[PDB]
Write an enzyme that holds these catalytic residues in place. Structure first.
Site, PDB file in Angstrom:
ATOM      1  N   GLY A  32       5.113   1.510   3.985  1.00  0.00           N
ATOM      2  CA  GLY A  32       4.085   2.082   3.136  1.00  0.00           C
ATOM      3  C   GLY A  32       2.824   1.250   3.202  1.00  0.00           C
ATOM      4  N   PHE A 104       9.400 -11.048   3.882  1.00  0.00           N
ATOM      5  CA  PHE A 104      10.158 -10.923   2.648  1.00  0.00           C
ATOM      6  C   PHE A 104      11.570 -10.432   2.942  1.00  0.00           C
ATOM      7  CE2 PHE A 104       5.900 -10.629   0.652  1.00  0.00           C
ATOM      8  CZ  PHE A 104       6.067 -11.580  -0.339  1.00  0.00           C
ATOM      9  N   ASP A 153      -0.079  -7.755 -12.641  1.00  0.00           N
ATOM     10  CA  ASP A 153      -0.012  -6.362 -12.200  1.00  0.00           C
ATOM     11  C   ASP A 153       1.419  -5.836 -12.294  1.00  0.00           C
ATOM     12  OD1 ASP A 153      -0.855  -3.908 -11.307  1.00  0.00           O
ATOM     13  OD2 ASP A 153      -0.834  -4.462  -9.180  1.00  0.00           O
TER      14      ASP A 153
HETATM   15  O1  LIG Z   1       4.260  -7.293  -2.012  1.00  0.00           O
HETATM   16  C1  LIG Z   1       5.389  -7.796  -2.023  1.00  0.00           C
HETATM   17  O2  LIG Z   1       5.649  -8.915  -2.480  1.00  0.00           O
HETATM   18  C2  LIG Z   1       6.514  -6.992  -1.464  1.00  0.00           C
HETATM   19  C3  LIG Z   1       7.733  -7.602  -1.157  1.00  0.00           C
HETATM   20  C4  LIG Z   1       8.767  -6.875  -0.648  1.00  0.00           C
HETATM   21  C5  LIG Z   1       8.640  -5.492  -0.422  1.00  0.00           C
HETATM   22  C6  LIG Z   1       7.412  -4.879  -0.735  1.00  0.00           C
HETATM   23  C7  LIG Z   1       6.354  -5.649  -1.258  1.00  0.00           C
HETATM   24  N1  LIG Z   1       7.196  -3.537  -0.550  1.00  0.00           N
HETATM   25  C8  LIG Z   1       8.131  -2.773  -0.071  1.00  0.00           C
HETATM   26  N2  LIG Z   1       7.853  -1.441   0.088  1.00  0.00           N
HETATM   27  C9  LIG Z   1       6.630  -0.746   0.032  1.00  0.00           C
HETATM   28  C10 LIG Z   1       6.622   0.585  -0.361  1.00  0.00           C
HETATM   29  C11 LIG Z   1       5.432   1.285  -0.419  1.00  0.00           C
HETATM   30  C12 LIG Z   1       4.242   0.684  -0.087  1.00  0.00           C
HETATM   31  C13 LIG Z   1       4.257  -0.632   0.306  1.00  0.00           C
HETATM   32 CL1  LIG Z   1       2.761  -1.408   0.728  1.00  0.00          CL
HETATM   33  C14 LIG Z   1       5.426  -1.364   0.377  1.00  0.00           C
HETATM   34  C15 LIG Z   1       9.427  -3.288   0.282  1.00  0.00           C
HETATM   35  C16 LIG Z   1      10.451  -2.475   0.799  1.00  0.00           C
HETATM   36  C17 LIG Z   1      11.641  -3.053   1.102  1.00  0.00           C
HETATM   37  N3  LIG Z   1      11.911  -4.383   0.940  1.00  0.00           N
HETATM   38  C18 LIG Z   1      10.958  -5.163   0.454  1.00  0.00           C
HETATM   39  C19 LIG Z   1       9.688  -4.663   0.107  1.00  0.00           C
END
Ligand SMILES: O=C(O)c1ccc2c(c1)nc(Nc1cccc(Cl)c1)c1ccncc12
Length: 346
Positions: A32, A104, A153
């Site tokens: 995403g 991560f 946030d």
């Molecule tokens: O920012 C963090 O610390 C951060 C850390 C871990 C994840 C994350 C964001 N975002 C995820 N998903 C995601 C879903 C939608 C949009 C975006 Cl940009 C990211 C995600 C999925 C699976 N495992 C770990 C993560």
């Protein structure tokens, strides 16, 4: 012409499914996009495990902020407490093609994705409780003196499930986070979860996270947000609808106080007069959290009526703790240690 053809016109690295990076990361697909940039799914050939790589935008402004985010995540790993299991773990970071990448642990869906699977009817009070207890532990980890990290946030999209079949969760996206004192922004939280002290332009501490958590837990059980503010003014009013006018001692020190209220000669505070003079809100404190949660009437919308785990006493405990997280006073707002000792967690 953007990073020698590696970035699009929006400073984002073009994600190529199957790309192998540094002979170590086999990028699978894009998960995403967000304000910081993108998150991709990747396999670490070294550790032989799946990871999620946070790719920051190739722009100085986004890089300079992600550097704070990294130092905050690294400082968190320096404290081997059990409580950081409710914070996502940053394994390592690197620069790849002028992009700062954060490796991560792989996780599952966010809490808003969960609410969508219920048609926004909400999840059970028992599940909400487990979400609440893990979150207060995470807030107590950040409250550690050596850390003192304000998340800034907190929102359902920033709370992720470790597994889609279980209840464990982890906070993600520390990109807006700061340490006490080192506060650098004044417009920081997401409207629906923005604390009144931030709305009022006052100084803020780690309590603004607790406020957001209170708004999150109610939405997690009802399925709809507690304060659906279309703007700052509409937000402050929808809070007043539930909790009444802020106490006079807070409004007497709020720089942005006259954005929402006016001081009457009485020495009392009251909402401003809408220009149209028309009614858009309920009178202050008349939209009761009692009835929002359906305490004596079978839960949110009467959906839980006649069902285990949602007794009147259970709601009375839940409503009490929530009202303590929604305290206007950031100095009296319930703090994580004592929230964990609330009778709502038995
Ligand atoms: O920012 C963090 O610390 C951060 C850390 C871990 C994840 C994350 C964001 N975002 C995820 N998903 C995601 C879903 C939608 C949009 C975006 Cl940009 C990211 C995600 C999925 C699976 N495992 C770990 C993560």
């Amino acid at each position: 012409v953007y990073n020698d053809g590696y970035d699009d016109d929006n400073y984002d690295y073009i994600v190529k499914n199957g790309e192998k990076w540094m002979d170590r990361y086999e990028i699978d697909s894009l998960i995403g996009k967000g304000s910081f940039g993108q998150v991709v799914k990747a396999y670490d050939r070294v550790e032989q495990e799946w990871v999620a790589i946070k790719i920051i935008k190739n722009k100085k402004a986004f890089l300079n902020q992600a550097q704070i985010e990294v130092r905050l995540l690294e400082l968190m790993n320096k404290h081997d407490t059990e409580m950081k299991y409710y914070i996502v773990h940053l394994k390592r970071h690197f620069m790849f093609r002028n992009h700062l990448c954060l490796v991560f642990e792989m996780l599952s869906y966010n809490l808003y994705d969960l609410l969508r699977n219920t048609n926004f009817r909400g999840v059970s009070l028992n599940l909400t409780r487990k979400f609440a207890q893990q979150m207060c532990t995470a807030l107590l980890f950040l409250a550690t003196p050596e850390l003192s990290i304000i998340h800034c946030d907190l929102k359902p999209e920033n709370i992720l499930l470790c597994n889609p079949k279980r209840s464990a969760i982890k906070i993600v996206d520390f990109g807006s986070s700061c340490q006490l004192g080192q506060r650098i922004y004044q417009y920081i939280q997401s409207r629906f979860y923005r604390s009144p002290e931030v709305l009022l332009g006052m100084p803020y501490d780690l309590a603004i996270d607790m406020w957001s958590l209170g708004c999150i837990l109610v939405e997690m059980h009802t399925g709809e947000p507690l304060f659906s503010g279309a703007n700052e003014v509409d937000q402050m009013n929808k809070i007043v609808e539930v909790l009444g006018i802020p106490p006079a001692h807070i409004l007497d020190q709020a720089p942005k106080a006259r954005k929402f209220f006016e001081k009457l000669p009485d020495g009392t505070w009251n909402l401003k007069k809408t220009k149209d003079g028309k009614r858009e809100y309920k009178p202050p404190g008349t939209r009761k959290l009692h009835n929002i949660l359906g305490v004596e009437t079978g839960g949110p919308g009467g959906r839980r009526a006649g069902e285990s785990g949602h007794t009147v006493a259970d709601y009375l405990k839940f409503k009490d703790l929530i009202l303590r997280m929604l305290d206007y006073d950031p100095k009296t707002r319930i703090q994580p240690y004592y929230a964990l000792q609330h009778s709502f967690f038995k």
